[model samples]
Target: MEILRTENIVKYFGEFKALDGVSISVNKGDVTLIIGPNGSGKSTLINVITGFLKADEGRVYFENKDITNKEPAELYHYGIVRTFQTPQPLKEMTVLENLLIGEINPGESPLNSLFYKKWIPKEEEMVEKAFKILEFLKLSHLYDRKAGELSGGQMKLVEIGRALMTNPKMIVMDQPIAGVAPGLAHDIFNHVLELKAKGITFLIIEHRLDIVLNYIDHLYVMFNGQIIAEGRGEEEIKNVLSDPKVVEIYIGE
Candidate 1:
């Protein structure tokens, strides 16, 4: 079943159209890949779906619910999260501390902190849970290390663990495997596969076709703000890549 869909999505920045009538679907528990050459609107489409950018024209449906104009906070509460092309982390904080920050909504009132102060016990629980997450990601040894000191691959894992703190149902990741070593990239992808088995749906925007081919179950190829192709399964992904438009816009560009 489709977990998310977009119909005639059009986004603009002043007068430049970023996404022009792009339509795509992310099915339940799918590892959907969105690929395109630079400036083909792949990022814009993911932004619109994640509620980071609003579409000036069209609609986005999530599990049959309209969310075209929902704010980021709204999307977050809906169990949808996203990771960036870069490793976004609290670099000054320890790995475990940074993960703990993920458990509490950042904007929740100061009074909310007082509520925790009175209980005190919840803090202990959160710390333990944070450690558990670190253990699950095989980063327990680095729990007290500064996030900024870790290697690119390790920071990527830290970011992923932080998202797990949210207990997300769906995640939209931008270049999850970019710039990491081949072995580490394979490990990260394996972690993602495990997450998918646990019922998490993924929407990924990535540029590395070689590694991506091994993991993605669905694909949507875009060019100049339009969806050139979309399909399910490995054959579907290959068929789209073999299409003339895919080469003209992506590989040839």
Candidate 2:
């Protein structure tokens, strides 16, 4: 089933067009990869989908419902969550505390802030879930440590853990392994596979094809704000690489 789809998405910044009639679909349980050279509108596509930028033209659908131009908070309720290219953990907070921030809590509401009795159980439940996520990511040992104290790779894992805390149906991740070591990057991809096994969907923007290509279920190539090629399997990768246009723009042949 298609969990997310974008139809002719177009975004313009002043006179510059960042996205031009780009369309893509992410199916349930698949690890979808979106790749392009710098300034190809990869980040623009992500911003538009996640509600950080409004599309000048086009429609976005999630689970068959129109969600175009919705705010980030509203999109979260629809089970669409995103992680940024830079891991933005609550630096002053503990790893587990950062995860708790992802969970929805009525206690944070001014209307219910004083009702401790009503929100205590909810807090406990979230804490339990946070621990489970840490265990899954193999960062349980760092649970009590300050998020800012973690190494770069560990910080990325914490971001993933925080996203997982939201219990999202689909996650839009921007360069999840952009700066991580090769071994750890592969390990992160392995975790994505494990999550896919549990029925979570991913739409990831990545530049490190060497570490990511073999694991993706589908691939989309974007250039000049439009999709130029999309396919699956090793044959698909080879075919896209062989395309003359792709070579000139992306491979600089």
Candidate 3:
């Protein structure tokens, strides 16, 4: 089943066209990757789909429902979640505390917050869920550590852990492995594959093709604000690597 689809998405900033007729789709349980060098409109497409920026033209569908102009919070309610290129965790808070912050609850209401007894149990439930997520990411040992104190790799794991607290069906990640150690980068990709087995869908933007290519189910290459090639499996990888257009963009003749 298709979990998310963007048809002919276009975005503009003043006179510059950031996205021009770009489209991509992610199926349920798929590990879809979008790759392109700097200024290829990869980030622009993500922003348009997630409602950080409105599309000048095109339609976005999630679970067969039109969500083209929906706000970020509105998209989140529909189980479409996105994480930033930079893992932004509350610097002073513990990993568990950051995860709890991701949980959406009625107890957050100012009026409801005043009734501590009524919300305490709900808060406890959130904490329990956060614990499970930490275990899943193998970060239970760092549960009490301040988010800012974590290593680059550890902080990335915590960001994903927080997203898991939202119980997302589909997640859009931006450069998830950038700047992390090689061993830890592979570990993070392994976690992504593991999550797919459990029925979560992912659309990831990554520049480290050598690390991620072997794991993805499908790959899309964007250039000049449009999808230039898309395929799957080993053969697809070779075709993309050797394509003249792709080479021209990344490696000059």
Candidate 4:
């Protein structure tokens, strides 16, 4: 079933139309990807859906409810989370600590924090939970290592672990494999496929479409702020993208 939908989204940056009537759907447990060249408005579409930017037109829905214009913090509680293109983990903090910070600790309440009775135990619980997430992401061995000490791909994995700590239903990723090597890129998407089997859906904007082609369930091609074409699975998308017209769109006029 469709878990998230954007209906005819439009965004304007000053006089420039950053996004023009862009629309897309994300089905439950599917890896949906938006592929386009720079300035194609893929990021703008994500911003509208994730609350970074408000749309000039159209609606954003999560589980059939209109959730347009909600702040990123508010969207987190609604089980929608986004992992950034650049993984920003605290350099001094350990891998485990970075994941722990992702959660909304119950001990933040003034009463609970003052008493030291409620939050301390929850803090321990949070540590335990963070470790489990580390293990699941295959980062348990590096739990005690500083986030800055990890490789580019490892840091990105840490970001995913952090997102998982929130127990999100859908994860929006921005250029997940943009700078990583091909092997690690496959590793990241393999983890994504594993998570999908466990019921976490994903919407991603990635430039390296060929690498992720087989892993994605649905693919949308955007050009100059519009969805020029869309397809399901690898074969269909390969064919769609190979057309002379779509080829020109990528190579430019």
Query: Which runs of model 2 end up more than 4 angstroms from their true locations?
Result: 85-89, 104-122, 251-253
Candidate scoring better on TM-score of 1 and 4: 4
116-184 per-residue lDDT for model 4 (tens digits): 332223377788888888888888999889888888888889888877877889998888887888999
Q: Give per-residue CA lDDT, model 3, range 1-253, as digits (tens).
A: 8888999998998989988898788899999999887888998898788777899999999998999988766787888777643233256667776676665432122122223322223377889898999999989999888888988888888878867877888888888888889899999989998999899999889898778888898899988799988987679878877888887888762
lDDT of 1 by residue, 127-192 (tens): 888888888889999998988898888888887887777778888888888898888988988999
What global local distance difference test value does model 1 have? 0.79
Candidates 1 and 3, the one with greater lDDT = 3
Q: Please give the RMSD to the true structure for each candidate, in Å.
A: 4.2, 4.6, 4.5, 4.8
Show how many residue pairs clash in every candidate, following the order shown.
Answer: 0, 0, 0, 0
Question: Any runs in candidate 1 off by more than 4 Å, and if so which?
Answer: 85-89, 106-122, 251-253
Order of candidates by lDDT, top first?
2, 4, 3, 1
- Every candidate's lDDT: 0.79, 0.81, 0.80, 0.80
Question: What's the TM-score of each model vs. the native?
Answer: 0.88, 0.88, 0.89, 0.89
Ordered from best to worst TM-score, the candidate numbers read 3, 4, 1, 2
